[PDB]
Each structure stands twice: as structure tokens, then as C-alpha cells.
Amino acid sequence: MSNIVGIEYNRVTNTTSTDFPGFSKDAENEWNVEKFKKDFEVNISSLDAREANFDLINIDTSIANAFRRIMISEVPSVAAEYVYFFNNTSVIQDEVLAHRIGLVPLKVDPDMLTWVDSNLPDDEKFTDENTIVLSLNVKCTRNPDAPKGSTDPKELYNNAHVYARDLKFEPQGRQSTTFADCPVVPADPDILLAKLRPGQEISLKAHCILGIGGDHAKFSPVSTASYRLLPQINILQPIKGESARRFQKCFPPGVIGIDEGSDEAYVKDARKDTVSREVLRYEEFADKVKLGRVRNHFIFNVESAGAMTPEEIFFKSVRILKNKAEYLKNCPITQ
Amino acid sequence: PDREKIKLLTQATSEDGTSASFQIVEEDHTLGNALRYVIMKNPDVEFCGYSIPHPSENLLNIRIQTYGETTAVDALQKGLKDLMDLCDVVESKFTEKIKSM
């Protein structure tokens, strides 16, 4: 047992932490930094402009899951909230178009907007520190030079497909200077917002405000933020010859390797392993292999929607956890 | 001075502390489970645990019971501070690794 999550053919064992005083007579594992500070490790496997893969090692499941939950549902992001239709003559209903525009992610960095206060009148609620205004003005006209038998609407008609790029930033007051170097643009500009035929027009502007993923999914800044426990494969007895190849076929191709000369099977990369327990259904490696998962080794994969970098999302999550802890500590307890 | 954030539930509180239920508004499993883990890593705590009484209410009742040494309020403050220190350590390690790479 002992920090390894047991992966069996019918059940999962040892999913709880058991690292607190009161678990045993030896009242060890009592909280102290300079012990967590020395044990804890961060290993960044990769870092991209939209995806981050990093390892949180020797941290608790509760803390790692707090980070994941905050990333998904508590890190703020800017999304369209109110869409004002001047004219929607297309076939898509206005409410559907508004939903799609809200689902479009904007490449506007937060901390450059202020949270909207709803305790104020609509005519004073939206400010320049508060809102991003994006306009969409697209009108479909039949292309007169359409090639013979050009069924494709792209050549048959002009502006027959509305894209997220068609949304244009309308700088308001300071926005003109604050967003001069970074004009608000859709993170994904090829999103097919709508498809129109000749005579159909779409004219709208959208008010994009800060929001919270827990409130509406459009405000969630991660396409997916999640972790997985590091898989552990223990080969208890030597497996060789052709049973070794059969053993190797029970894992993803680069997981375990075949030794040369030794001819035995050995674990080459347990990180590449999806825990499918395919080896646990064969009654010939039953006494030869032990599948597990390190309970406190987390492989975080953060994919940002496009507004911020995944490392910034993760740091914002840990800061949010710290800040709510600090706010609760400073709050006086009422009877 | 936010007096509506965390409340001591007096009906579920013992005499001379050491047992108390705290109601924390606008909190959920995120803070609840991390706080429970940290508080349980306190050698004086004999009982920690939170419940979200109803999904329709942004509410969180966290129950702390200690031995006679300290009080539940003391244990809760210690757990909050220790979570703060934990997040400090995680921030420092992450920033160092992001800088290095």
C-alpha cells in the first residue's frame, strides 16, 4: 500500500491520504513547512502558448484538486455577456447567435478590466474600465462573378460565412490607449459564428465583461484543466521470450520496452501509460505484474482557451486559493 | 470588516470551545477539502470535516473538534494560516521552475 494507489482488475484501493497525525501511534506527518517546503517538487514537462504539462510532486490530493477546481471555475476571464442586435436577418435566432458569440473566447488579458458592479443603474454600470465592446457588421451579397457551377457558397456569394474574426474591437475612451498595443481579438478567429445567404445581414455589438467559470462556462479560461496520478508498473517476476511481447502489447506502445540480450520485459516509460488494466485480464501475468498509481504525484495538463497562458492560469489558481484562505483568516468570526 | 462571511454556529458549539461548527458563505468543496486536510494535519484536532448542506445555497459548515489543549477557533485559524503557507511554497516552487526551465 503506502502511498501507492492499488490498481486491481475489479477495484481501486488506497485512494486516501493517510498522512496526518492520528493515523497511527506514531503521530507523524503533522503539518510543518520546511518539511513540505523540502519535499514538494515541481517538474514542468512542457510549456506552450496554449498548453502546459507540469508535475506537482509530494502535494496532497485535496490541494491539487483545489487548484484544478479554481482553474476550471474560479479564475476570471472576459467573455461577451450582452449582445445588442441592431439587425439579425440571418436564419440563426438572435438568442442562438448571442450564445455562440458568448462562447467565442476573446484574447483580452484580464487584470486590465474591472469587475462589473451590479448594484448600479444600467446607464452607469458599463464603463471603459468595465467592458469591452465588440461589433459585428456582416452583410451577404451574391457574388456576380461566381464561376460556372460553383456550388461552394464562398465563391457563389460574398460574406456567406460569419467568423469570430468578423467581430471588431470598439475601443471606448481609455481603451483606445490601454488596448492600443493589444486590440481585443477572438483567440479562435475561424469559429463559424453564422452562415448567411444573399439578402441576410447581421449587425450587433457585444459587451464583454469579466466573469467566473462557475457562473457561466463561457468565462472558464481553460479548454481543460486536469491532472492524473503518475502510473506505476511493477514487474514482480521476470517476463521474457514471447510472454514478454504479449506483456508489451497490453500497454501503449512506448510504455514498456524489450531488453536486448536480457530479453526480459522492463518498464520504459510509465508516464506514457493509460491505465487500462489490459494486462490484468490475462491470468498469465497475474503473479508477475502489479499496477499502481502514485497518490501524491500529479501530472497537470492545462490547456488555455486563449486569453492567458496556462502557467498564468495555474499561478492565478494558487493565488486564488491563498487569497480566499487569507480573507477567511482576516474575517472575524460572528456568533 | 466582513461579519457575514464566517459565523460560529452556537447550537453546535460545546462549552469551553474545543468543538464548533463554522458556517462559511460563498465557499464550496475547493476551500472545504483543503482546509479539512490542513486542519487534520494538526495534532490537536480529533475531528475535522465540512458539509455543504444544500447545493442551492452557497454555504459551508465545517466541524472542528479538538482535545482539551486548544479550541476549535484556534485550530481553524491555524489551518487557514497553514494553507496560506502551503500556497506560498507552491507559488515559490512554480515561479522558480517557470523562470528556470
Partner: peptide, 17 residues
């Protein structure tokens, strides 16, 4: 990548509305 953005930038969005 591999550059801090939180140290330089004031996290205004993380304030409580």
C-alpha cells in the same frame, strides 16, 4: 514561454467584486 507575468502585472481581476 518561461517568463513570469504575475510578478510584473497587478492582478486586478482577482479582487472580490
Amino acid at each position: 514561454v518561461s517568463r513570469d507575468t504575475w510578478n510584473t502585472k497587478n492582478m486586478r481581476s482577482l479582487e472580490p467584486p
